[PDB]
Ligand binder design. Sequence first.
Ligand code: CA
Ligand code: CA
Length: 162
Amino acid sequence: TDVNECLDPTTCISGNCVNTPGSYICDCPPDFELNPTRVGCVDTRSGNCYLDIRPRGDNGDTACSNEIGVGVSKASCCCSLGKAWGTPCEMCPAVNTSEYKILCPGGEGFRPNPITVILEDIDECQELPGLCQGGKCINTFGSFQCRCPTGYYLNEDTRVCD
Ligand SMILES: [Ca+2]
Ligand SMILES: [Ca+2]
């Protein structure tokens, strides 16, 4: 007798479940690899996180700009305020696509732990310090705060206190 673990929608986080006699297999999507326990699929690559992109010059050598993080996972970037990542710099998946569902399984502000696939908070003050250039950054579960010192104001676009 065998249970088909795939009938539970949550089976194989960010991956495609294939039921076998006894247990099941997860078939990860490109750019993702199996986590140590084989219950989910994560993207372990590392890159820089950008705030703006746009065709601007097109593809070729280089593409993105206004860096806010260096050597971070693509989920920490895109599941947060990032808009582009890596080099070749790939653009971040639109929030309404299947790609975003796979990459940001818990939605905005969180990411699957690289080892357990359990969701956790993206601590923006540690990984994307470029989000509060010249201000006090206080991380929060699902977000973070940025306070500019007396006399300066947070420039929403460039993210620089003034
Ligand atoms: Ca099974
Ligand atoms: Ca956070």
